[PDB]
Amino acid sequence: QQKRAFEYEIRFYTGNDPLDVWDRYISWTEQNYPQSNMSTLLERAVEALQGEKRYYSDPRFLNLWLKLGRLCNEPLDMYSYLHNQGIGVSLAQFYISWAEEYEARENFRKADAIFQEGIQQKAEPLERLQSQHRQFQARVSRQTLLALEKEEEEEVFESS
Template sequence: MRDLQDYSTDVGQDNDSRKRKLDEFEWETSKENVIPLKRGRNVSDLNKALRAHDSFQTKMRLDDEVKAKEDAIKAYDGDDPLADWVEYVRWLEVKMPEDTRKKFTVLEQCTRALKDNPRYHNDMRYIRLWIQYADLVSNPKDIFKYLYQNKIGECVSLFYIGWAYVLETMANYPQAHKIYLKASQKYVM
């Protein structure tokens, strides 16, 4: 017969094992709050991020990191400010996957901050940020109209694909076809 100490060790190991298994599926309890990414997510990073938000200290640390990233963007004096914005958005997607409002705000700030810089008008990174922003607004068609009117993305195929996709989801197939034709006339497809 096993003694009580052996049994308590087994129970402790079973509890640890169950906790690890539950931690592996942390995202299952929060997936409706996580913004899906077209490129997918690393499940272990996602689980870590979701577990981390349970702790007050972790929230404070994340707030400090957000402030540091925003301060770095404001103080940036290099030749590619877009790189910091792109890195910040990716960081948000990993560290704060359920915070749609924060991502929306950062995308809006970035797209507005660089909209008058012609250097970025046909930069694929910038167009991707605009498309991510359009994915979060209620009427993405207006975003694409704005971009087209301001010649942002006019030489980037992803711009036309995104615009046509939005029109197709609205069942506006004739207009989507026109966008594809416009893209082929620009030789971007």
């Protein structure tokens, strides 16, 4: 076949950037199986890298967790945990992703708090975080104005 799975799996990895192997292996998987053993590769990468403070600001490390969060049925608990470990906390995408989960559940005040914390931390790229924050706010504001229109319409019906 193509058990390149074997080529990656042969971890007599002796270098100083272990995340590198996994990054390439994860990337290979989503490039060959666009939907895969993916979810158990991700769990393995993360466990292999469990407690490694040095990668807590690495976008390749955060990317593992964003991919897991997408598959996970409890991502909110996942982000809370990562935040307590200080994983991804200096990265804009960590906050964008966490806030989007709350926005999806219509908890706009929590999503906003997450953006604002990321901004106060000046998580990188800050301009991506600010842009996404403004887009989020605009979505909520627009949804509100349309909702209010539907309320006003029904309410006005009730008065006849």
